[PDB]
Structures are given as C-alpha cells and as structure tokens.
Amino acid sequence: HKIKGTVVLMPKNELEVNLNAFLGRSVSLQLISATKADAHGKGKVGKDTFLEGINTSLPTLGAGESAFNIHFEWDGSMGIPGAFYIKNYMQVEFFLKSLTLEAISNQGTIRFVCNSWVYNTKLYKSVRIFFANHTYVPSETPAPLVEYREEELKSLRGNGTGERKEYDRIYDYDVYNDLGNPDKSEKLARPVLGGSSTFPYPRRGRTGRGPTVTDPNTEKQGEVFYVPRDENLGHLKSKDALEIGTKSLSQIVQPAFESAFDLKSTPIEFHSFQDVHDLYEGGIKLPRDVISTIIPLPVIKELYRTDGQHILKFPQPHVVQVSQSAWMTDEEFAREMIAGVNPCVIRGLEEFPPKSNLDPAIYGDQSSKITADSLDLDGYTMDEALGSRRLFMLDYHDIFMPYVRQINQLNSAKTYATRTILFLREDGTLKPVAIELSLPHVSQVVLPAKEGVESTIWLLAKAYVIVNDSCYHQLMSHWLNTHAAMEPFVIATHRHLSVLHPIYKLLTPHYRNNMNINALARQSLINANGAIETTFLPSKYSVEMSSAVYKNWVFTDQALPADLIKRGVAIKDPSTPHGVRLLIEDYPYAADGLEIWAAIKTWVQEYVPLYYARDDDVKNDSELQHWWKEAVEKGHGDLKDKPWWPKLQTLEDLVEVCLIIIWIASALHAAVNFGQYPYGGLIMNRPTASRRLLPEKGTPEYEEMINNHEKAYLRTITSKLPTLISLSVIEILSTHASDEVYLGQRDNPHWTSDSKALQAFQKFGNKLKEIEEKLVRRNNDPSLQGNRLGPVQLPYTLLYPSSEEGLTFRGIPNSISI
Ligand SMILES: [Fe+3]
Numbered sequence: 001h002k003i004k005g006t007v008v009l010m011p012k013n014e015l016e017v018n019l020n021a022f023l024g025r026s027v028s029l030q031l032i033s034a035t036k037a038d039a040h041g042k043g044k045v046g047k048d049t050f051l052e053g054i055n056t057s058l059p060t061l062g063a064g065e066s067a068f069n070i071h072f073e074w075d076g077s078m079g080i081p082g083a084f085y086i087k088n089y090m091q092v093e094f095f096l097k098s099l100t101l102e103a104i105s106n107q108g109t110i111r112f113v114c115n116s117w118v119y120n121t122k123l124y125k126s127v128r129i130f131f132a133n134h135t136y137v138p139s140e141t142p143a144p145l146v147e148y149r150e151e152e153l154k155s156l157r158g159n160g161t162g163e164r165k166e167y168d169r170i171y172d173y174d175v176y177n178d179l180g181n182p183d184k185s186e187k188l189a190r191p192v193l194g195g196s197s198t199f200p201y202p203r204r205g206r207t208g209r210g211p212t213v214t215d216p217n218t219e220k221q222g223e224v225f226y227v228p229r230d231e232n233l234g235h236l237k238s239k240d241a242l243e244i245g246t247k248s249l250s251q252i253v254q255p256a257f258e259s260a261f262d263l264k265s266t267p268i269e270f271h272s273f274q275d276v277h278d279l280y281e282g283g284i285k286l287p288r289d290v291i292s293t294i295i296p297l298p299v300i301k302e303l304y305r306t307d308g309q310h311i312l313k314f315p316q317p318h319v320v321q322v323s324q325s326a327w328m329t330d331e332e333f334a335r336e337m338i339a340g341v342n343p344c345v346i347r348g349l350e351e352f353p354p355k356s357n358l359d360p361a362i363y364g365d366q367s368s369k370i371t372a373d374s375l376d377l378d379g380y381t382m383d384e385a386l387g388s389r390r391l392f393m394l395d396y397h398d399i400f401m402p403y404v405r406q407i408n409q410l411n412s413a414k415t416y417a418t419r420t421i422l423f424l425r426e427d428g429t430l431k432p433v434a435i436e437l438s439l440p441h442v443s444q445v446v447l448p449a450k451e452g453v454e455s456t457i458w459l460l461a462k463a464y465v466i467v468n469d470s471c472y473h474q475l476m477s478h479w480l481n482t483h484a485a486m487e488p489f490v491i492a493t494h495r496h497l498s499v500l501h502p503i504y505k506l507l508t509p510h511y512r513n514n515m516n517i518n519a520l521a522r523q524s525l526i527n528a529n530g531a532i533e534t535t536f537l538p539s540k541y542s543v544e545m546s547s548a549v550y551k552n553w554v555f556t557d558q559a560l561p562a563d564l565i566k567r568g569v570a571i572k573d574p575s576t577p578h579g580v581r582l583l584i585e586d587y588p589y590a591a592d593g594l595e596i597w598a599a600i601k602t603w604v605q606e607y608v609p610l611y612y613a614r615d616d617d618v619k620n621d622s623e624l625q626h627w628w629k630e631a632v633e634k635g636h637g638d639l640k641d642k643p644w645w646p647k648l649q650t651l652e653d654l655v656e657v658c659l660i661i662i663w664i665a666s667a668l669h670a671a672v673n674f675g676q677y678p679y680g681g682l683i684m685n686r687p688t689a690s691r692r693l694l695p696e697k698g699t700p701e702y703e704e705m706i707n708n709h710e711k712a713y714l715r716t717i718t719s720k721l722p723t724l725i726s727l728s729v730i731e732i733l734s735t736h737a738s739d740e741v742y743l744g745q746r747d748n749p750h751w752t753s754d755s756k757a758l759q760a761f762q763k764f765g766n767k768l769k770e771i772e773e774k775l776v777r778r779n780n781d782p783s784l785q786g787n788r789l790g791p792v793q794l795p796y797t798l799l800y801p802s803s804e805e806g807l808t809f810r811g812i813p814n815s816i817s818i
Helices: 143-157 242-262 273-278 288-294 330-339 382-387 397-409 452-496 502-511 514-524 531-535 539-550 560-566 588-610 615-619 622-635 651-673 676-680 700-707 709-716 720-733 755-780 782-788
Strands: 002-011 027-037 043-045 066-073 081-088 094-105 108-118 128-131 391-395 417-424 430-438 444-446 570-572 580-582
Touching: 002 027, 027 066, 027 143, 043 081, 043 143, 081 094, 081 108, 081 143, 108 128, 128 143, 143 452, 242 288, 242 514, 242 531, 242 720, 273 709, 330 430, 330 452, 330 588, 330 782, 382 391, 397 417, 397 430, 397 452, 397 539, 417 452, 430 452, 444 452, 452 502, 452 514, 452 531, 452 539, 452 622, 452 651, 452 700, 452 709, 502 588, 502 651, 531 539, 531 720, 560 570, 560 580, 560 588, 580 588, 588 651, 588 755, 615 651, 676 720, 700 709, 755 782
Parallel strands: none
Antiparallel strands: 002 066, 002 094, 027 043, 027 081, 081 128, 094 108, 391 417, 417 430, 430 444, 570 580
C-alpha cells in the first residue's frame, strides 16, 4: 500500500547572482509517524525512499521550481506521517520548497512547507527534519513528535562555540565587536558596543571568526559575514539582491569614485545649486575607466543611467519633481518633521523656555537662550500658545551636545547641537519660529528672515538642524530602532520556538532578510571607514552615538500610541476609535500609521485566542517563556533590569509583544526607510554633514555669504564626493525588490493547516486594501493638502500597504528586508 508524494525544489543555479541527476539514489526521504512510536517513544521511521521521476505535468509551479514524483511504502503498522528526514547525496546543495502527500490522513492531503537549503548529507551532524504544517503549542504536540521537536531546537541553538560555516543553521548572540579593523590600522579600532554599562547595545548574530591579532576583544575580518543559511536569501533575479549592492558600493564603486577626485577629472566641489541638479539632468561626466569599473556590476548598474563612456545620471528625487525650489521654504522644512523621512522626533512643548537635562558642571547653563518676546506666533501670546498646545519642538540639544566637541575636532566636520521651535498655526500647518545653535565650553538664536544676509543665515541655520536630523534618522530612527533592535528577537525565535509553534508562524514572516542585511551592514555600512562613517557628520563616532541613545530605548514606548503620547503630540482619549487624540490633527505619519497599527492589532487579537484561551495557557507555554526570557536577558541583555519589560504572563502581554514586534518590522521601518531617496536625493534638502560653523562678521567667508549664498550653503554641507556615495546608498535602501513580500501577504498559502487562522489572515488582507483606499482619499482631500502634499506637491504615500517594485515612495514590507 503506497502513498503518492510530490516534491518541489529549486536547484542552486536558479537562485544565484541538470535535472536528471536528482533521480536514482541521489535524494532520499524517510517519513516519520505522528501516531505510532518505537520503544523509546519516538515516531517510527520509514525506509529510505528516492525521487522516482520528473513531474512536468503540474500547473501550480513557479519560476525555477521543478517537481518530482515519489511513492512511499507505508503499511498499517506505521500510522499517520507528521514529519520527514531528507538526505542529499549530491555534492551540490538545492533549495527544498515542499512535500505534498496525497490522500492519507483525516484531512486527506498532508502539506509540508519547508523552504530550506539542503546541503550534502555529510556536512550535517544530524539529519535534516521537516514537519507538516499543523500548528502545536508544546503541550499539544503529538507524543511521538515531542522529542524530535526539542532535538531540532537544540540543534538550532548550537553550543556557543566554533567558527560558523556557510551551511550551518545555528542561531546565537554576540556583541558588536566586529566593526573595527585594528589589525589593518590602529586608526580603525572601535569600541565594543554591548555588554557594558558604558556602551550598552543590542546583540547581533554570532559568527565566531575569533580574535584579531592586536585586540583580543575585537573579532577578525572575513570575506563573508555568516548568517544561518536560510536567512541568506536567494533571489530569482540578480537585480533583487539589493542587499549585496551596498557591499559592491563600498569595495568597488567608492574606491573608483575616489580615484576620479584624486586625478582631478571632475571638479572637487559643487559651486552652484545647478551643479547639484545636474546630477539628475545631464548627468555628471567621469573618466572612462571609472564608468567601465561600475556599469558591469549587477544591482549597482540599475541605479544610474549612462552612455557607456563618460555619463552617470541619477534618477530625479520626488521632492524636486514639481518644484525645484520648494524645499527651501519654511513650510516644507516644517512639514517634513511630520510627513518626511524622519517624522517621529518632534515633541510637544508645555513649558517655556525648554530646559536641558545635561550636567551643568560639564556643559554650562543649558537653559535655552530663546526669548518668548522674539517669536512671531501669528498674534498669539506665549501663554495662549502653550495653553492651547500649539507649541512644538525638534530638540537635538541634549543628544548632540556630548559629542559636539569630539566631532568638531575632526578635520572636515563642524556642527552645532540645535533646537527648533515650531508653532501650529490656525490653518493646521507648522511654522518654524526660532532655531538655537549651541556649542559647549558662540551659542546663538537665529530667527526667520526672508531678505538680506539674515535670510541666508537662516537657511544655513536650517541646514545645521537637518544635519542633526539626518545623523539621528540614519543611526537612531532607522539603524538602531529597526535593524539593530529587531535582530535579537529573530535569534530568540529560531532558538526557542519550534517551526510548529503558533507564535513562530505569526512572527517569522516579519523577519525575512533582516539578519542578512544587518550582516552585510556590519561589513560595509557601519564598519570602520564604511559608508556611513565616510558620508555622515560624526565619522568614527557614528555607531557609538547610537549606543548613547539606546540607553533610553524602551520597548513598550515603541508602540505607536505610547510613542505619540510620550512625545506630547497626542493625548489619551477613549472617545476616539484609536484611543488617542492627535494635537496635530493632520499629522500624516501618525494619522496614517494609526490605521495600520489598529489593523495589525486586530489580526493579533484574532490569532492568539486560536491557541491560548487563558492567561494560564500563556504562562504554561515552556517554549514561549524561554523565548521571551532569552530575548530580554540575552538579546537586549544590557537593559534586562529595567522595569518596563512585559512579563508575558497574560494573554494581553502576549498580544502587546507580538504587536510591537510586527509594528517595528513592517510599518515603522517602512515609514522611516522608503522616503530616504525621495526626500534626501537632493543633498540640499537632507545634508548628511556640515563642515563649518557660521562665518564671523568681517571675514571673507561672511562676504561670500552676502554675495554668493549658494556657495556658502554648499561649502557648509556635504562635499561632492560623499554626496555621490550617499545618494547611491540611499537609492538602494529606498528600492523595493520585485520579490518583496508586503504586509497582509505570505510566501506560501499553506503555512498552516488551521482553517480559522487562515480566515483571520484573509480578513487582515482585506482590511489593508480598505485602509489603502481611505489613505488615497486623504491625499485627495483638499483640506489636508497643507501637510499631506505641501509646497513640494508630494502626497504622503509611504504608509500605503501595497506597492510595485522600484523606487515607489509607498508600500509596507512585512519585515526589515533592506
Ligand atoms: Fe532599513
């Protein structure tokens, strides 16, 4: 009596950047019973069974997928299959998608969703096992599968030692000691981030390459930063390997650009604003050997357009797509703090002046020098303004002040720590009314002006603010709060939740490609002399600055309502549907985000109850308790003592934790990531660095400012060479791969057998299509054009759920996938 099976797999060549060799005795499968056990209680194991033949007569197949027939001998003593071993006897690895068994059990068909690389059987200490798609909390695991379930978890965890190899599937933690390169040079040494109270930091995935020669504390370099093999995503099309673009940029392209500036083949500085707009019109002209080193590289070559010989042209940023000059206005400057690339730092102001929390013994009186009588508040008094909650601020003073001295000693960096005061006008748009530029150890207030040298000083003051915001966005809003903060949860999930676990299935789609991009970022983006260090103001202090901000990171404050309330931009109000009332009614990021938040909340609340009926059930899930214990105590271990960590003893706790993780991975990361090039592609709108302080009265710098304001700006912001590298970086980060999996989607529709979970997930996908319509309406509502479109006429679509491939300024991926 035979069971007919179909195996779907992808050979290696199809996923990189001969089908009959799979037949014969090359690939074996053995089924494992879920209902009949041997003496020691384990599911009985069937016989080695080999792929019989190709199956071209199957219509569901996708690109690169091939199917194979197989028939198992499975008699009455064997029971119902719930798992299977596979052994690859080929020398090459292949990517196993699924096994489908026809007509055997109560539900008839048994589906195994695998999606896993299967290397030659000699490379594995234990045989590869895969489970059917039924969901089981540990207490409901069929008894003959119990031991397998735990043994695979033990295998994923490893023993905390060893150099990790390509095919390893071992998840473990380590600190950020792999960014400095002291064996090459003592100037490339970097503090270890994590495991101390000086430099607390989230953990990253352990690689085990062992110590450098000069510093035992720092991990040595490698050509390949390991991630556990199934995190290392293959792509059908080489253009979708966006993550490897950043590696090419730093190793190949940037040294090429650097040659063209050393040989004086192009002007070393921008000289007008037109020199910058040229980048996306006539292209910049370059030596032939530089273009010939760039245009053959995959991914990199998709960024620019070229004539083959001398041109590289960048695409046109969305922000200059209607007005070339609207970025320069105070209204857009202000609007981007609520509908821009970094829309989540502005705070409400309830006392005036604002005060610093810094130690006056080290910095001085840090009471703000801004006077209430110098502000033009549209006729309001200060008391009125405060009292009707119309005053706001972008306060970077306390964050940057401890680093200004260090940064200002470097050779091509000068900055201030800035505060910006904003007033909410009766028409609902924000108005900037003052900017304070502070130094430690002059520290000036600058007021809006439209005429005279004073208006140029104001323009420059706005640039220092945005330099501040750019550093904070890249390192904090984006790198720390999404990429870095999420990796520990990824590791914990694979270590302590079985593939069988309901919460494993809920969360893992929101991890896709996360460990992989971080690994490549640790190697090329945030490493010593990497792309961030060489294009952003703080140079070698960039990453360690994120450690200072992480001291105040709070997991429960990452929930959107908690965040709006913490920042003074909303108030708790149980008469609203979302439970908060916005103090800036028309706040695009928060207003759109609250719809996404609520939809995710509904999905999570409908899913958990399918597997957990009572707080008792949560408390008694050993796998769930071990996961959460480790995530806090090891993954975010330097913050394990804090009192705000949920305890995970209640249904409500479980829903809260899952909702925060999914929020961070999908919509939060999308809102801060996918506007990077649309707004920041014009280097004058989002300068990444500043190079001098304001010119002093009676100097030729000052004279220039009066005569040529464009040159005083460009001479202040990011130089030409870093501009080219950084636009390329953010053009990559802003691009959706064609193979993205967006929110409300999943790669496989049979991820679970539970028809109830599948329907709750179908309702979620609908609710998102509905919301996307509501958001399209808002962008067309002419009452909201002041904030949603602004003078640059760029509707706020970053929180549209769906999107097509490319640089689209919309679409929420499931995960931190780039
Ligand atoms: Fe990102």
